[model samples]
Target: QIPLCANLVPVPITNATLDRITGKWFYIASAFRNEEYNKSVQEIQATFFYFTPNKTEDTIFLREYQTRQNQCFYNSSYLNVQRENGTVSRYEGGREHVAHLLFLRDTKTLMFGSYLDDEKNWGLSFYADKPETTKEQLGEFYEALDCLRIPRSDVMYTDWKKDKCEPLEKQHEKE
Candidate 1:
């Protein structure tokens, strides 16, 4: 079992901090729930997080691209976000998940603190600018999570497999 940090709290962020972070990010590592996350092989191979502009106040739009059943799943949704407070809340098929922005350490990396309905299935995401990264970068990312008292075993490394992914356009045409 992946152990979670007990005494953890999500830190707040500001608008400036959120604004600087735009464009696509790759998940370097994540604290994922085993049962739900292991549904399909393609779902685990996904690596992109595309952030798009939102016209609504205190909100952001994001298109999540993933490989599911050897197909590209490009799903866009609105997040009720507070840029000043650095929080984002959204629902997936009517199920809610609220995430807190923890830190944007550098141009290469960022972190988010998240929690689900059960509360026990919490989350922590570490994202990077590129799909492939270096070992040192992994160490640095791990260190940041460690600083928050998260154990190394708790994180699920999001390793990339280029051959398994398909273009987002390919999936829409079938729909």
Candidate 2:
């Protein structure tokens, strides 16, 4: 239930890194530059699966794309952040500007931690994540099959949905 994630308050849960994020994450599309969206857009594609005894989560995105010049895209879901200091951010259930990284494998520069998104900041990744991930594993989980994206803009692309992903109380219920 991470439909864009940000609604925290689920403490007392920790196995830390949750066994390196219970596998499956495929979505390649997003590179929003500034200056009124001069961009790189793959439209929509997202898949996440991290489950284990109700620490469960799943999201799907695709089937609403546009940006030959203008822009449009859809298929998004993420939410399940419950943090009052027990630390649980699988995404959504927010604690505001939250960022957490421990990616190993796939050469994207990893092993960085920012306890709840900047109680300080460090190593936002200049492409790290290969402690021997065997050339990064993306064994395909079906979404028309095509996976290879490991740069979440350092991990908080949440202007609370501008280009369109929609998750923050429906962006305040459409303002």
Candidate 3:
């Protein structure tokens, strides 16, 4: 039998785990029970992000590129990492957004369990090293969704072909 919600636990944020997650990750799919996040996802056609960790500090540098309506947007920010709590948080618009880090057995995939001031704003997001993921990987995501009682119909998958940030990403890489 496959493990469900009760068996899933946030991965503790140690230096090794932080280093393991450092690099580029593509936004694969997400299931948002939260109305606001659900609406926001509809605006995104494709997205990817980079994580740069500081071994000695409780912060991680985040750079994200998102495509929307045929245009691309870039954002740079810092995330506060809580080692003991296995969570990453960011402050935006006077609010603190927290997401618990959940890693699968495969190092190529990463998941986030989000929390907000309101209980209804919680959700699950999945990411991977590549733009596309296998059905096997998706199966795990589905299990997490099932555990959360989020309907399968609520899942949204990003389109890699619609990505518009590659030019800028390449430019940044050359620098």
Query: What lDDT would each prediction earn against the true structure?
Result: 0.61, 0.28, 0.86
Residues 56-114, candidate 2, lDDT per residue (tens digit)?
44221212222222233333334343423433333334433333333433333222223
Give the residue spans of candidate 2 off by over 4 A.
1-70, 86-88, 91-175
Off by over 4 Å in 1: 1-13, 32-43, 116-121, 162-166, 169-175
Superposition error at 27 for model 3 (Å): 0.4
Q: Which pairs clash in the backbone of model 1?
A: none
> What does candidate 3's lDDT look like per residue over 68-157, in tens digits?
999889999999999998899988799898889887656799898875223466678999999999888888888887877788798998
Q: What would the TM-score be for candidate 2 when compared with the true structure?
A: 0.19
lDDT of 1 by residue, 29-60 (tens): 67644346424322455558677545346667
Off by over 4 Å in 3: 116-119
Q: What C-alpha root-mean-square deviation, in Å, does candidate 3 show against the real structure?
A: 1.9
Error of 3 at 172 (Å): 1.3
Q: Which candidate has the top score in lDDT?
A: 3
Candidate 2 local accuracy as lDDT?
A: 0.28
TM-score between model 1 and native: 0.72
Model 2 residue 132 CA deviation (Å) reads 44
